[model samples]
Target chain A: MYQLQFINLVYDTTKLTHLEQTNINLFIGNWSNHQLQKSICIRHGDDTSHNQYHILFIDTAHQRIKFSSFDNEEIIYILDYDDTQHILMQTSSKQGIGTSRPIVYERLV
Target chain B: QVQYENTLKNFKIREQQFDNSWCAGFSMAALLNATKNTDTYNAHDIMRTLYPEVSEQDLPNCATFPNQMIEYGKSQGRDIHYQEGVPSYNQVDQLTKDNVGIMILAQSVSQNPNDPHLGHALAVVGNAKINDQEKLIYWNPWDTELSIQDADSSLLHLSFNRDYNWYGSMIGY
Candidate 1:
């Protein structure tokens, strides 16, 4: 089994003023183009609406993270990153509800 | 009270006449008809009773043959669910290696972005090697209902999902 590392969240203060800071898990693997994968389970919170988010990271040389619901139905957001450490997650739900933001971590030896 | 022998006999009869295509729904409905106290014939009603909390968000469409089997089992008081993670290719290969009647779920790109949960499901009977590519053979209740091929490979691959660690369940036979 491939292990994942947890990372801290650095919010864009200007764009995400209303958001509270949170931490999420960030798993790194050598992903080639057209490779499809899913994320590990995150701790669920009392915020029922924002409890679960399914993540798929497609590394097309340039890495991109796709977030959806557990059922693989809702498209939460798609984020691209040049550096693996710095990830920016955005929510596209129109309900104006605060989306559950996951923390990112580095792989530990 | 219906004895286990009678129940199994009834199940066999329905299993034979059942439109093999809708095997998931038919099997699920038959299980309910046999086990439930009431004589309700609606599959959705039984599903609601099994998963009372299921909302519109929970699209019950089976994306693969195993998924349909799992869903049916869950509806019939089988305790089953899925864990999260991207299952390695080897993991998937090992899980389906045996013909032990396991349930599998797959993800498909929905045609309607508004309705994200839109996908189909089926039951996996067994696995086989076709055209040198290891393929899974499935029994689709939906396709069978439409008079399409009941046990065909072309229709089976449509249920493949690249998503790792998709949800599933199994009943030991």
Candidate 2:
């Protein structure tokens, strides 16, 4: 049983805007931080509702980001934030040996 | 097979919660578990007890505090020995050979001296001395990864460089 003491929203959601074209939704423009009740936030472009995860730390050498979810800590391992591709990658295994799941959020400002 | 791999497989190693700063707590717990000292304490619970005075806002600062871990290990009746500075392969080899569960606290400095130093904690769960390979197998509490490599691997980075410094804690006799 993993417990989280604090929650951080990974994306700066206030500056984020979303649009749908033929039901293909995308987060539009400048991604920045959202200050709501002193909790930071981030949202995947496909998410209907934004989830909060506290960033445990960034493994710069390994290019992975570790974070804690509401139900468990070490819940996600994101491999690198590619500014050029505007893509965020999530791995099924925290060890990063599983299939690579990509979440593409194009920053078409 | 190195050592204690089966034992480590039995106990589900825990990850640090919240700000992910409880690396020491989780690493210490893993050490306790591997050393067969798991009884009344755990990663999160041990941290909760150790950090009663730590406010929720200040919880992130407790990332690499090994004193609390050492104190808790001592309370649990294990001879918890701590040594700061660079770690030696010979020492790790000796301890793991003796079936001691070891946890290492590693710190990396930012290029900007004014910035906060980066910290990580990991438990050494296994050791191997083969003809061509001598490796230290460690459990990283930061994630679900079990690492197997030579003790001097860049991944572990136990050596003291301009950017890094480390300390190790060996649990038991």
Candidate 3:
């Protein structure tokens, strides 16, 4: 009786494209970038309420992390983090419109 | 030569008919059948049980996701070099070259927990050229039940060494 939950934190749409492009560019020409993307999907999981598991896309070049919901219209949340291993500590919300969280991740892969 | 040819022929036949439920269980079963072993079970138990009995040279049958496939092969009969983490693309390529196929579980875009269509399993047959583009062939089991042509190639430019950046645990056989 295990359930999976995905939460999408809302973020500014204008900044998402920029963040994704920057992150992809930063990893471009690097050997580990593809691995980074694949790893993101592999680490995703869920809980009983199906409300807790998430797949995170960290664009270090843009200093943002994108979280997409597994059940919705790809509802997304974009937050900012300084270290690669830390959960996002800040958000890009401007005028109370952007979403951010403080959870960080330790690079285990 | 005859034995190798027969094995290759059987492998090719199975590979051509990939589907959605191409999990480790099915893969092991295929391997067993190819080698002519007849044991009935699921994926998880097959790996857990058979791993110990497999000869050091043929231990690739226990491969799972998150990069363990390569490390398990390199470790041979011992478990020391097997790190509790993901493997690099180079490692994956090496394992694949050594004839270790990969199995991945994909969840449906729908979030319906009760829906049986929530998730599916697939296997990596090999790399091939189609429409002049390099692609990976994915085999599955539930494709027919789901009424879909589950076997297809992916042009996502996936590399195993780079793709091993994340780790995951396996579920259901």
Reference-based lDDT, each prediction: 0.33, 0.48, 0.32
| Arranged by DockQ, best first | 2, 3, 1
The TM-score obtained for chain B by all candidates, in the order given, is: 0.39, 0.70, 0.38
Worst 10 residues of 1 chain B by lDDT: B1-10
Looking at model 1, give its docking quality level.
incorrect
Candidates 2 and 3 compared by lDDT, better number: 2
Give candidate 3 misplaced runs (Cα > 4 Å): A1-109, B1-23, B31-94, B111-117, B143-173
Give the worst 10-residue stretch by lDDT in candidate 3 chain A: A92-101
lDDT by residue (B1-173, candidate 2, tens digit) is 44333223334465533333566667777777656645444566666777688777644334434455567777877777777553456766666556566776665444344333455666766656644566666666545656564656544542211223444444552
Model 1: per-residue Cα lDDT over A87-108, one tens digit each: 4333333121112122232212
Local accuracy of candidate 3 as per-residue lDDT tens digits, B67-150: 343343233332212232333334434444555544443332221342111222344443433444333343343222111111
Give the per-residue lDDT of model 3 (tens digit) for A29-106.
211122123122212222443444243565454444445444532234344443544323222211111122122333
Instruction: Give DockQ per model, in order.
Output: 0.02, 0.05, 0.02
Tens-place lDDT per residue, model 1, B1-173, is 21111012122112321111222344345434434433454445433444456574452321124444456566556544453422333333454442223333333333335322322333343444444444443333333321111122222233111111223333321
| Interface RMSD for candidate 1 relative to the native interface | 16.6
